[PDB]
Amino acid sequence: DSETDLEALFNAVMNPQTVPMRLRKLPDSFFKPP
Amino acid sequence: RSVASSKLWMLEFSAFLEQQQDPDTYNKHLFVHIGLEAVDIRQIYDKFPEKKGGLKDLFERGPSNAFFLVKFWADLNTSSFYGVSSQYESPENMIITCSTKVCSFGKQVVEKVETEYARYENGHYSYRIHRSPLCEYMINFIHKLKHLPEKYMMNSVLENFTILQVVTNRDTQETLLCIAYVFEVSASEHGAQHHIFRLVKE
Ligand SMILES: *C(=O)CCCCCCCCCCCCC
Numbered sequence: 257d258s259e260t261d262l263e264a265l266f267n268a269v270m271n272p273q274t275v276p277m278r279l280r281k282l283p284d285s286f287f288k289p290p
Numbered sequence: 291r292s293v294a295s296s297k298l299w300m301l302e303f304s305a306f307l308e309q310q311q312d313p314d315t316y317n318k319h320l321f322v323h324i325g326l327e328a329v330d331i332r333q334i335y336d337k338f339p340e341k342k343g344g345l346k347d348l349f350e351r352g353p354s355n356a357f358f359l360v361k362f363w364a365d366l367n368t369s370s371f372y373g374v375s376s377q378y379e380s381p382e383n384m385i386i387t388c389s390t391k392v393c394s395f396g397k398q399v400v401e402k403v404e405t406e407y408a409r410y411e412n413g414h415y416s417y418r419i420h421r422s423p424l425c426e427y428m429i430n431f432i433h434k435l436k437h438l439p440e441k442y443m444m445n446s447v448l449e450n451f452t453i454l455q456v457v458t459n460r461d462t463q464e465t466l467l468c469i470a471y472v473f474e475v476s477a478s479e480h481g482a483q484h485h486i487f488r489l490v491k492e
Contacts, residue, residue, distance in 0.1 A: 258399050258427065266434050269443045274336060276449060277472070283327045289363045289476070289483040 292326065292486045295356035298386070298417075298457060298466035300324070302377035305424065310369040319368040321432070322473075322482050329359050331489040334470060337396050337452045345454065348468055349489070357468045357489035363476035366436055366444070372424035378417040378457070378467075383408045385460040386417055392427060393452045400427045405460065435475070444475040 278287060293300040304323040310316055331349055338345040349357055378386070388404045402425060408415040431451075435444050453471035458464065470489065476482055 258394070259430070261394070262431065262434065265447060266438070269438070269446050274450075280333050282329060282333065283487070285327060285485050286329075286361050286487070289478060290485065 293324070293358050293360070293467065293469060295353065295467055297356075297380055297382060297459075297464070299379045300376060300457075300467060300469070301379060302375065304376070305374045306372075307368055308371045308373065310371075319365075320482055321364050321366065322362045322484065324360070324484055324486075326486065326488050328490045329487045330492055331357065331359075332491075334359065334452075334472075334489075337450075337472075338393055338454050338470065339391065339396060339398050345468075345470070348456065348465055349491075351465065353465070354491065356465045357470075359470045359472070359487040359489050361485045361487070362471060362473045363478070363483040364473050365476045365482040366432065367476075367481075371421075372429050372432075373421045374419070374424055375421055376419045378406075379411075380408070380415050380417065380466070383410075383415050384466075386466060387458045387460045388419060389454075389456045389458070391454045391456075392425070393454060395450045396452070400425055441475050441477055448473045448475070 291299065302325055304325075305321045307319045307321070308316055331345075335346055340346055386406050388406065390402045391398045392400045402422070404419055404422065406417045406419060408417060435447065438444050451473060455467070455469040455471065456465065457467040459466055
């Protein structure tokens, strides 16, 4: 079930994996808005 | 002219909440709205489904000029209707299929499929997905994001959230557009912001 996974995700970030985007080869404009 | 292959251009894209105060009064809030730097596509493969007909398979099939990556800074600051509206132009009169797949950790959780036909317009043809209902998962996802005390927590959740949109000629099965969507929450004065990138092989 995806609703139960969603709930676990959101409880997880409140009560503290792959390579995050910020460490990948992406342009600077990817991370800072115009 | 930004999100455009040689056979299809998406002029407009928006996702919105509309509320009806009374039968004559309506309030619309935009979460995101679109109305050229390159990115190596191999950088985002792990973030989308990669079985048969996944992002990789689609890119290698080509045409390589149909593939785009859009970064959204979504405005979550707001009788209810949750909708998605998009408009497209093509030189050709086609039957287009639009597939939108919502992904979590690179796995499809929900897919919506729409079939659209052409309308003649100034020597070319236009296509429109008007007021398509935003699915339950996305409504609930948005609600859960909104209740987070911290914005950086929202971004942490969105790190493993992606949306893949594939527009296809139903008869030839040619990919007309493939748009990969990555999201953050906007923290600015102007509200919702975006940046469009082209996906390349290297
Ligand atoms: C369900 O039917 C899938 C269709 C989802 C269409 C994508 C709409 C984009 C949502 C943008 C809102 C920003 C959320 C952080």
